[PDB]
Design a protein around this ligand. Sequence first.
Ligand SMILES: CC(=O)N[C@H]1[C@@H](OP(=O)(O)OP(=O)(O)OC[C@H]2O[C@@H](n3ccc(=O)[nH]c3=O)[C@H](O)[C@@H]2O)O[C@H](CO)[C@H](O)[C@@H]1O
Ligand SMILES: CC(=O)N[C@H]1[C@@H](OP(=O)(O)OP(=O)(O)OC[C@H]2O[C@@H](n3ccc(=O)[nH]c3=O)[C@H](O)[C@@H]2O)O[C@H](CO)[C@H](O)[C@@H]1O
Lengths: 285, 285
Amino acid sequence: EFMVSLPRMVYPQPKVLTPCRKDVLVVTPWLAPIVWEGTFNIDILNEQFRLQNTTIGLTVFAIKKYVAFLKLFLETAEKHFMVGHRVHYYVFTDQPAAVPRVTLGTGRQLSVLEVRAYKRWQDVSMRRMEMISDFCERRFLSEVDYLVCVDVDMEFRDHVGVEILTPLFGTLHPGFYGSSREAFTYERRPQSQAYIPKDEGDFYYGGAFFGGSVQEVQRLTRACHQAMMVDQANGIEAVWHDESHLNKYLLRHKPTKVLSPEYLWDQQLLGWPAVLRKLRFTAVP
Amino acid sequence: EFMVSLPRMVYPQPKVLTPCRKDVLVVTPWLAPIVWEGTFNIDILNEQFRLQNTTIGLTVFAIKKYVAFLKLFLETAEKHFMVGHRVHYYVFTDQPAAVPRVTLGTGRQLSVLEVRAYKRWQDVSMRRMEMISDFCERRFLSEVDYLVCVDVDMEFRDHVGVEILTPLFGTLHPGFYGSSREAFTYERRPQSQAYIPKDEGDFYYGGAFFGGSVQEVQRLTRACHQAMMVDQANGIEAVWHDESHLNKYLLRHKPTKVLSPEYLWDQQLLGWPAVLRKLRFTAVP
Ligand SMILES: CC(=O)N[C@H]1[C@@H](OP(=O)(O)OP(=O)(O)OC[C@H]2O[C@@H](n3ccc(=O)[nH]c3=O)[C@H](O)[C@@H]2O)O[C@H](CO)[C@H](O)[C@@H]1O
Ligand SMILES: CC(=O)N[C@H]1[C@@H](OP(=O)(O)OP(=O)(O)OC[C@H]2O[C@@H](n3ccc(=O)[nH]c3=O)[C@H](O)[C@@H]2O)O[C@H](CO)[C@H](O)[C@@H]1O
């Protein structure tokens, strides 16, 4: 929509002849920014998004025993996720009375959406695509500008803000950002909808953190669900489930921003490398 | 609009831990790509834009003696500008019978739009904003997806393609890309609409090459024209005319891509520095 003028702001001048990072790739070959610390001035971005009255939805599934993760998830989201902006949390659970009472900042609200629990963890994980797509029909189009879709067994430890927002984003999986594409754990069986040949692939995106505009998230989640249903009719389940399908989708429909592994990390397994200036969203050990 | 799937493509894998340029800034602090050679894979971008059936309009003014520049301008545009894509050239002139007969490739067309000639070069240059804005009302919304607005006393010497396309872009002026903001020749008189204080400014954009979606170009050109009219009522003319106003606009409404000086160069005045891997669009000596 129509965008008013930014106010006067004083900040350091961008330096054309100085790279903003000398150690990492900060733009994809299709000219999508790769979001690392040092690539953005959050003061400028916060102005741009506040002037558009941006509302961010954050979807999270807490099914069966994973309700235990919600307290820390939501408490740390309150400290670090889109602070200053309008936020709507959507907690999908089979136990709607077991969502913890977390105190929310002003302009932030939470809705609990009851869903069925599948028996296998694989199905719980995979059926998020259907459940998100179903909810894009009603709630999300009327309530938010962007959707952010994450795993619950996680905590925010540092800023996750409007720098991530764009029509469609994925996040670099922390186990593969330095790997060659042949080592990526894409689905490699041609019988699956998620099949990616050994000579294709840009990145290995993590299934635990993706998002975009409601329109683009509806598209992604619908496509992944329909692909899963084809596989199921054919008696095949992708090797890494929803993540496999997400990877196939983002190969053929390129994201408009890619998040660095700052945004999806596991310190227990991978430590704190020099290349990560901040660890923003991390696995609970 | 709805975007179909990219076909299978084989190309080099992006390297997350290798910067694409070690000598230049490739992304602005508001996460707009800065377009240099080596930042983009044109095969991927050409697919994306061809699948959207993209049409690019290219506006150029050839008023009074500047009709002499059209032949080379258009001949070199045919060799280098958006080849493979639908192009519509819009030549604005006071001499509609003096446009040279340049042979166009398939899918490329040219319209001649007659306009008045102002006496002073300053006014000819400045009134392009009004003339472009007026034509965005009718022709451009129905005929093109993007508009590219350039000076005529120029030639294409290398690829200028869909890598530039985005909602709103400006180009780094070749005289100031290495300068500190205090040295930028912004309008510095507070009495002018184009005023920029000494402590503000991201880049000095060249008035000779800007563009965007028709919507965004309509906004920019309208705003610059209305600002010029206020200045004229107050008896002041911005120091660098349309370029001054363009700079004020792009300070307060940040571009979604910035073009490096590859896209706006003068080899006579500035030679061929190591930082420029290609000289794409250049002054005629
Ligand atoms: C790469 C890797 O080694 N992945 C392991 C990890 O996958 P994942 O960590 O990818 O699986 P996950 O169990 O975290 O499922 C993804 C998300 O789905 C939701 N969810 C899933 C199950 C459930 O009962 N309730 C629920 O709410 C929740 O939001 C969770 O964070 O963990 C699995 C079981 O945990 C398996 O050990 C996988 O091999
Ligand atoms: C930074 C600098 O030193 N700028 C000089 C340069 O500005 P510019 O090169 O910015 O002015 P310009 O005369 O090229 O005008 C911009 C554009 O307007 C169009 N146009 C302008 C005039 C005209 O009679 N017909 C016409 O068609 C044409 O598309 C041209 O390329 O040239 C001017 C006269 O040329 C002055 O010498 C300026 O000081």
